Design a protein around this ligand. Structure first.
Ligand SMILES: *[C@@H]1O[C@H](CO)[C@@H](O[C@@H]2O[C@H](CO)[C@@H](O[C@@H]3O[C@H](CO[C@H]4O[C@H](CO[C@H]5O[C@H](CO)[C@@H](O)[C@H](O)[C@@H]5O)[C@@H](O)[C@H](O[C@H]5O[C@H](CO)[C@@H](O)[C@H](O)[C@@H]5O)[C@@H]4O)[C@@H](O)[C@H](O[C@H]4O[C@H](CO)[C@@H](O)[C@H](O)[C@@H]4O)[C@@H]3O)[C@H](O)[C@H]2NC(C)=O)[C@H](O)[C@H]1NC(C)=O
Ligand SMILES: *[C@@H]1O[C@H](CO)[C@@H](O[C@@H]2O[C@H](CO)[C@@H](O[C@@H]3O[C@H](CO[C@H]4O[C@H](CO[C@H]5O[C@H](CO)[C@@H](O)[C@H](O)[C@@H]5O)[C@@H](O)[C@H](O[C@H]5O[C@H](CO)[C@@H](O)[C@H](O)[C@@H]5O)[C@@H]4O)[C@@H](O)[C@H](O[C@H]4O[C@H](CO)[C@@H](O)[C@H](O)[C@@H]4O)[C@@H]3O)[C@H](O)[C@H]2NC(C)=O)[C@H](O)[C@H]1NC(C)=O
Ligand SMILES: *[C@@H]1O[C@H](CO)[C@@H](O[C@@H]2O[C@H](CO)[C@@H](O[C@@H]3O[C@H](CO[C@H]4O[C@H](CO[C@H]5O[C@H](CO)[C@@H](O)[C@H](O)[C@@H]5O)[C@@H](O)[C@H](O[C@H]5O[C@H](CO)[C@@H](O)[C@H](O)[C@@H]5O)[C@@H]4O)[C@@H](O)[C@H](O[C@H]4O[C@H](CO)[C@@H](O)[C@H](O)[C@@H]4O)[C@@H]3O)[C@H](O)[C@H]2NC(C)=O)[C@H](O)[C@H]1NC(C)=O
Ligand code: NAG
Ligand code: NAG
Ligand code: NAG
Lengths: 584, 584, 584
């Protein structure tokens, strides 16, 4: 309980002030030039090129067995896969669905031969393998591996020739100098090698006499026994097999870029000296330079422009035909992360390769930040602008009310207890020091004027007693604990006089110009001019490196791992034999 | 320096206005119906099924050597892996820890045999390989590869049989029609094939006589020489090895879904016609349809419901037992990205497969945007609501103060210099045009009234001189550079008269009703009614496609790459020989 | 159209209130202690160690051919790769660029030999393979595979020995106990095995006599025929090849951590009991414990401290030399996600392994949330602070204007129609009930006072008629539809009297103290004290699990898949033969 009182000497012209004129209201130069449009986004093509081929070979197996007392012992099993010559394929397999039981091939630089069962050659019917199914089909001529034992003491040799044709899956990866077959065999020729249309400049590691190409060739369907439709067919004979595949030109088969997403609602704007492609349907934003990117700098990029045009046309005439018009030709941009943006601008009526990143998350982040930034910026700019207009409006209240109570308004603006006077169009102020220690303040009981019955004091009389005996002042209780050094606040005595005057931390209650009681300030109910506004803060948050699958998991999805099998199995000599022991 | 003055004709009833009544305060219908709960989130299981098996085989190696003058030359080395028959495994390996030095097998459709060292069969002790360690263990019967040279001019043949048993790791991937062994061998039978409990309908590519199953079988621990515990054991004999493994039913061994995260604090709400699962402990939000998802549409999904229940029970009775209650049975939902949400609703006291995406980042983005949106929306709604209440409160000030200075308040509201009068409950206004060119304004020195000593002008006298000679008006200086066309602002002459009046861009200072000096407006200190508010904007930001490991890096972690080894090594014939040369 | 009127009994002292004093303005204790700095961030090294090696072997191929009537048949082709002994490499290959046409090796625990063309040994020149190119180079001694047929009825055997040297790529993965060669061969020795500097404690599975190390060894460049520069060279002879490589110590060759990013602008602060490393140039934030992390707990982490120092020095003296100073030695922290932060604090003038996560997105999220949080928090705190100051300033208007119209101000604050009086420093209020049903209100035409010509009513006379006959009151029309129960609002009659008084939902127009017409409130133009503020909300947004490449795509980039090749090709016996058929 510490009551502070004030004393207010009259204002000399020592300190004159004026009310600050209205402020110029802020301007945030938001609003950007944009352009609506359609986009097709492309990514680096990382997928192998896939096609169908057929392998033609013979399993040749030569076995030497010795018969003994106990039984038969195999002394040698020489197994070899040999290519079926093109002549056999064209004149026997594809005409009759048969294959010779004699293998005719070269090995160790010699023309050599082998006869199934060591009998005279017959053209054997090609029969579907029992595991044939939709997917992988194959045909063969025997189920047997001919070998002959004979009578004890002797070594006999027998030959097995099994003529085999498999349909296989072929794969090739950029730059397409070779292809791999699902038998494990690698073919060191481009899948696009041929004799027409410059295709003879494709890569190959084989002498030309191993390669054959037949226009309008007709392959036999071994199951239906019928001829399939004519197509240019390649045959290449390698030392272990012949491969056959239907030739297609490279131009129509591979592309280094592939469609990632076609995008109907796109807005492009100039943003930090770049182009920004905001795609609200993907919650994704891509950023390129303002310069178009020339796709001709990229190997095999021909598919993109044409395919993009067709897509964009489909878009335009389906959802934009009435509403917008195209304002130029298509444009192409290289976005951050290695994405190719193919952009068609609209208007409403009113030699490298590209490496594409593995995640578009950064571009979703980019979108999410931009969206939030744009929205809170626009809202902050409105608050800011409205606040300014509000202060400027309210100045008129301050200015209009100032003559009614200059001291009270000035004291609030200056955050300081002052006395103020109006001097024409200007305010004159003076400081009201706090009443000091060693002073006592006595409240007088009567607000009546001595010797009058019609004239009263409008506020209580007080005497200010110096406790050290300097003197006593006869003043009155002003407002807000101000003490006035005179008694010139007077009024006509009213009937039914009831007043509460603030006195320190109490209200002091008078009736009929006489003191009645002291009341605690806290005993008087409050009403509030304060409009509540309760703003709280965004709290701290820690994001964890959440993963769906670890790197270990993602490498643990396959049947076998090559390196693991090799590590374990090349030990075999070391684990089960002594490689260091030498018999003398 | 350009001073503008105004002239204000009295308001006719031509333009009467009223003060806009209080506005209805905005309502943002925020607040959503939610439901607390517990969740277990599942993901597509991509991991191979892993189990232990044992392989039983014999290395058979037949060598033919010729002795010469110089030394010995190996002419042939025929090597073959042969299966150990089940009878040998059950009656010799598992009873005695021994294996016959004679291999008895079929090859080329013939029963054939081989004798270690070409001697009579003995049951050889199985001995641990020197590389045995925790991890991979194996046993064998010899360290030698028997071969015999003999005397020059002759060819001798010798046989090595080394009986080998390895513990191996087995792997199988969905749909579990086969399994791969760490020897590289593929077994074309389900690991779950057996004779009991429908297991005989599992896939197999082998004739039944190759398969054996023994209930309560007891395998011998070759190292401790003791019998291990009884279990149903499979044996399958293939042409190169016999495999043994302990059979377990499929139901208990594999599941197509696997636990990703159990989640204690979950809130579900209806959000854009969907269910939203906000998980503040993961900073992650998942979104499904409101319809439950029936797990029975998914192959091998039985593990999920039971495991989830047990987990959820653990959660409930450990941290929620006192505080909440379960308000139903468990529910299951399919969330965006291929996550299965198993959700238990709470209340406080008061045939396909599923493909799961590789990243949950989108769901963390989803969380982060939602959290930010919810918070700034709620705060914007409070600002907006408080602002409205504030304008409505302040209207009372405008209305109450209006009779004191109608012109000044109206001029600020209309942003236009007007003169206003109160006509009862209505405001009457008129426009105050700017004083034009070709006019000069002379300030009179004296504010005293001619012929009086008790009566004065309350503001300075001015004469308005038309510079073209139209006439002179005798008026006075009003407020804010208004010029009044009369001289009826009068007051009793006070003592100590000091006034500053605004006159163009100067204050004009009078004392005792006489002009004293001109003072520049900028020479008078300001006090401000403007409460400062300094809001700045979120700045532009560019996010880069940051990667930890590129695709190249992630494929560069293994010892060998299969395709690379093949590309390089199938060239071998081409690189070091001439395959095209034919000797005649 | 429902007009409500009020009646206001005079306020007794029953309800006295006071104006709430100014509120203490909120304090948000924002502002954090930070420290500027430089960082180098490290990640788990997952890349294989790569080096160059050379393999030395001989292809030995023994062929037996039988001549017949028809032609030649190959009966056996025994092929073997044999190691070239170190003596041959040091004394013949590296001195003369030649290799013996005789292979001398061990197999089946016997010293054995082979002669190219079965002729006497010659030292054959090593010749570059025709496929030699920048990348992979190799040399050999013959292009032929010698074999001999002879005359019919006979079997002849011939031997081919082709001496081969290839440059290969070598790979090793942690913990570096072995290495893989690009021929497919695994070498079961550390690439860092040697005889110096403790290197003899590295792993090896080979007897020591297979290993050789030569200090200052000089390898021959087979193409230039010149000796290369001296270096410590290892040779290891395995049963199929000899490997040669230039030895380097492990310390300088491998590290378990690798630089991810050097970072110039870094700010560290204490945040949720942790250290926060905000990196505005990466839009990425990392979080560690406040405790430094001791790198000595990690295998092979020596490269980090030294390399980091050098990098940081480069940074400091290039961009910070004048502006800041280093305030300590370098510090190292383990951040969430498995990143190692190497941090150098600045001041302006004024045994495990670490697993690093695959994505830094969470740390970009962390940055983006922090940045947004910091900015809207700081702005909310300013709004909140300015709002409070504004209410406190405006209280002075409420307080100063209160004596002019206590009822109107109190009615707005209390949101209730009250009558208020000032009783000294306190407000006395009373409720003004709505005028009830069954009452009719008649407006009197004349505001003139009967019997006077100089005295008038200041507002219209009204009579309040009880429709049930309780009586009539003669009062007047107060403000805002208040009805006053007396007629004591009087004024001197003015000239040109024109007033509009609100009466229900009409204004009622008087001239010269006489009624003239009724005017609809909506016919009187409004001016507004309401400053507009239009805030809208962030809208709902759904983020989709966007992927650039699916898991399928990322596994579809290679030429061949090992598991696929094996699955398909180990069927071969089953698909094209009958393995179950036994010939008797
Ligand atoms: C090497 O020897 C093998 C045998 O060891 C031999 O394999 C046969 O290969 C032929 C193709 O050349 C297969 O014929 C196909 O059979 C398909 C249906 O197979 C299922 O049903 C069989 C029921 O009997 C069929 O055949 C018999 C006569 O044998 C006949 O009476 C019936 O009407 C019926 O047609 C059944 O035997 C078979 O069982 C095998 O597969 C199961 C899989 O679970 C396995 O577990 C068994 O152990 C067994 O191996 C199976 O259940 C049939 O759909 C298919 O038809 C296609 O082609 C025809 C044209 O002919 C089209 O009309 C039709 O639309 C289809 O496209 C085809 O006919 C035959 O099944 C094999 N035999 C065996 C025992 O499996 C090889 O030919 C020999 N090779 C050489 C070089 O000689
Ligand atoms: C084919 O020939 C090979 C040899 O060329 C032969 O290999 C032996 O295989 C047996 C198992 O059959 C191995 O025995 C194991 O040895 C473990 C400890 O090995 C370390 O210590 C050895 C020290 O000598 C041991 O043995 C000698 C007698 O030889 C004895 O005096 C000692 O007390 C001691 O027991 C040491 O030789 C060995 O060195 C090899 O490995 C190092 C690795 O750095 C390599 O660099 C060397 O070049 C060398 O190859 C190594 O340092 C032992 O812990 C283990 O015990 C397990 O089983 C027993 C039961 O017997 C349990 O009681 C125990 O808890 C363990 O589970 C086991 O005894 C032996 O080491 C091999 N010998 C060699 C030279 O390595 C094969 O058996 C032959 N195979 C056939 C078919 O004949
Ligand atoms: C096994 O037999 C094969 C042949 O079947 C034989 O292969 C030769 O290997 C030698 C190296 O030992 C190769 O020599 C190299 O040739 C490089 C240029 O090759 C291109 O140009 C050739 C044009 O003729 C060259 O040689 C002739 C004489 O033959 C000469 O007149 C010319 O001036 C010219 O030098 C051309 O033959 C060759 O064609 C092959 O490759 C194409 C690729 O498209 C393929 O399609 C063909 O079918 C054919 O296989 C090719 O176009 C040359 O740059 C290189 O030079 C390097 O080394 C020298 C040092 O000698 C440096 O000075 C120089 O800076 C380079 O570093 C090198 O001279 C030769 O090309 C092979 N021959 C053939 C036919 O390809 C093996 O040697 C035999 N091995 C054994 C053990 O005997
Ligand atoms: C008492 O105090 C007053 C002011 O507080 C001072 O002016 C005066 O000198 C003091 N009187 C005595 C007697 O000390
Ligand atoms: C001078 O100007 C006044 C108004 O500015 C105009 O009314 C008057 O016609 C002018 N007088 C002459 C003589 O042109
Ligand atoms: C008429 O109404 C008044 C107040 O509305 C009530 O006091 C009075 O009793 C009523 N008079 C009659 C006759 O019912």
């Amino acid at each position: 309980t510490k009551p502070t009182f004030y004393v207010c000497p009259p204002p000399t012209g020592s300190t004159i002030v004026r009310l600050e004129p209205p402020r110029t209201c802020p301007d945030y130069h938001l609003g950007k030039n944009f352009t609506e449009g359609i986009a097709v986004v492309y990514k680096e093509n990382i997928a192998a090129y896939k096609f169908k081929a057929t392998v033609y070979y013979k399993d040749v197996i030569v076995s030497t067995a010795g018969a003994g007392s106990s039984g038969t012992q195999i002394t040698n099993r020489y197994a070899d896969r040999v290519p079926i010559p093109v002549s056999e394929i064209t004149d026997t397999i594809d005409k009759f669905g048969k294959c010779s039981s004699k293998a005719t091939y070269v090995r160790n630089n010699h023309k050599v031969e082998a006869f199934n069962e060591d009998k005279n050659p017959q053209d054997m019917p090609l029969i579907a393998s029992k595991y044939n199914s939709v997917g992988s089909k194959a045909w063969h001529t025997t189920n047997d591996t001919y070998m002959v034992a004979g009578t004890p003491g002797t070594y006999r040799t027998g030959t097995s020739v099994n003529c085999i044709i498999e349909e296989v899956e072929a794969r090739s990866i950029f730059p397409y100098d070779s292809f791999g077959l699902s038998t494990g065999d690698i073919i060191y020729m481009s899948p696009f090698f041929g004799l027409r249309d410059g295709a003879y400049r494709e890569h190959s590691n084989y002498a030309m006499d191993r390669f054959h190409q037949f226009e309008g060739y007709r392959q036999r369907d071994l199951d239906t026994r019928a001829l399939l439709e004519p197509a240019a067919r390649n045959f290449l004979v390698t030392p272990h097999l012949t491969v056959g595949w239907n030739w297609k030109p490279k131009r129509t088969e591979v592309c280094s870029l592939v469609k990632w997403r076609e995008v109907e609602d796109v807005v492009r704007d100039e943003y930090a000296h770049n182009f920004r492609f905001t795609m609200k349907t993907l919650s994704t934003t891509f950023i390129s330079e303002t310069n178009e990117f020339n796709l001709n700098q990229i190997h095999l990029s021909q598919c993109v422009k044409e395919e993009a045009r067709a897509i964009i046309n489909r878009i335009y005439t389906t959802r934009y035909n009435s509403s917008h018009v195209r304002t130029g030709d298509i444009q192409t941009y290289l976005a951050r992360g290695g994405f190719v943006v193919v952009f068609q601008p609209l208007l409403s009526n009113s030699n490298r390769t590209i490496t594409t990143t593995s995640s578009v998350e950064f571009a979703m982040l980019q979108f999410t930040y931009d969206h939030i930034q744009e929205h809170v910026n626009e809202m902050l700019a409105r608050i800011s602008s409205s606040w300014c207009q509000l202060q400027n409006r309210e100045r008129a209240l301050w200015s209009g009310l100032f003559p009614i109570n200059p001291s009270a308004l000035a004291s609030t603006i200056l955050d300081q207890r002052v006395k103020a006077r109006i001097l024409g169009d200007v305010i004159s102020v003076s400081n009201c020091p706090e009443l000091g220690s060693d002073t006592r303040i006595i409240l007088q009981n009567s607000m009546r004027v001595s010797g009058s019955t019609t004239r009263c004091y409008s506020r209580p009389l007080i005497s200010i007693v110096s406790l050290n005996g300097s003197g006593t002042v006869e003043g009155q209780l002003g407002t807000d604990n101000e003490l006035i050094m005179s008694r010139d606040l007077l009024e006509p005595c009213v009937a039914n006089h009831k007043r509460y005057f603030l006195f320190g931390h109490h209200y002091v209650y008078y009736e009929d110009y006489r003191y009645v009681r002291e009341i605690a300030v806290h005993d008087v109910g409050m009403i509030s001019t304060y409009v509540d506004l309760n703003l709280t803060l965004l709290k701290d948050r820690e994001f964890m490196p959440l993963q769906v699958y670890t790197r270990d998991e993602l490498r643990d999805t396959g049947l076998l791992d090559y390196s693991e099998i090799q590590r374990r199995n090349q030990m075999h000599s070391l684990r089960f034999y002594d490689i260091d022991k030498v018999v003398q």
